From a paper:
Surface Plasmon Resonance (SPR) interaction studies using a newly synthesized GlcNAcβ1-xGal series (x being 2, 3, 4 or 6) and F17G crystal structures in complex with these disaccharides provide insight in the structural basis of the variant-specific binding profiles. In each of these complexes, a terminal, non-reducing GlcNAc occupies the primary binding pocket in the same orientation as observed in the initial F17aG structure with GlcNAc. F17aG is indeed highly positively charged, with three more lysines and one more arginine than F17bG. Near the non-reducing end of the disaccharide, Arg93 (purple) is bridging the GlcNAc residue and the sulfate ion S4, whereas variable residue Asn90 (cyan) of F17bG, substituted for Lys90 in F17aG, is bridging the O4 hydroxyl of the reducing galactose and the sulfate ion S4. The majority of the amino acid variations involve arginine or lysine, which consistently lead to either an introduction or a removal of a positive charge.
Residue numbers in the entry: 1 to 21, 29 to 133, 136 to 176
The structure:
């Protein structure tokens, strides 16, 4: 089986968080969302994840997209499985495989989770830059091996909480 146990709408990062020192801010996992338990799965269900970023691509760094928020501020974005180190660097605006997948035991149960992580980028200087709450994109479960979603909700959404960068 599969069922949806997570939340449809999800905020990334603490609201009105402040961060200090294209220039990339070292924010680690602070501007993140993580949930180990988004779908409940059982009895041989096989599932991975696709991610999609809806923000405009305004540049590229080391093979991943810089996504634009404002004239001064962009984002590097990762989506993936639960643990932050599993994140896949996002490029472009299409669905992208961000977790190859796994299969829960034929006789047992577990969950499928996810993580979204971003790091702010100064694209252009004015030295205090604020960003408002902004839709980022979505992640969808991707069944495989003949597993079926039925009509279970496949997709969850992410919004960037507002933040301020101090330079
Ligand atoms: C037998 O326990 C299960 O072990 C597998 C690895 O064999 C896996 O770690 C399972 O945990 C889930 O793993 C998912 C895919 O990595 C992940 O998306 C979920 O968050 C994990 N669910 C948890 C940690 O409760 C584990 O149940």
């Amino acid at each position: 089986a599969v069922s949806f146990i997570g939340s449809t709408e999800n905020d990334v990062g603490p609201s009105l968080g402040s961060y200090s020192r294209p220039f990339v801010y070292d924010t680690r996992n602070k501007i993140g969302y993580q949930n180990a338990n988004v779908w409940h799965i059982s009895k041989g269900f096989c599932v991975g994840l696709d991610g999609k970023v809806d923000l405009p691509v305004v540049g590229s760094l080391d093979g991943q997209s810089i996504y634009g928020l404002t004239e001064e501020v962009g984002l590097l974005i990762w989506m993936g499985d639960t643990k932050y180190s599993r994140g896949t660097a996002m490029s472009g605006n299409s669905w992208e495989n961000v977790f190859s997948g796994w299969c829960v035991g034929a006789n047992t149960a577990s969950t499928q989770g996810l993580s979204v992580r971003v790091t702010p980028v100064i694209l252009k200087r004015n030295a205090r830059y604020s960003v408002q709450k902004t839709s980022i994109g979505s992640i969808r479960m991707r069944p495989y091996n003949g597993s079926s979603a039925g009509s279970v909700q496949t997709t969850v959404n992410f919004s960037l909480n507002p933040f301020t960068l101090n330079d």
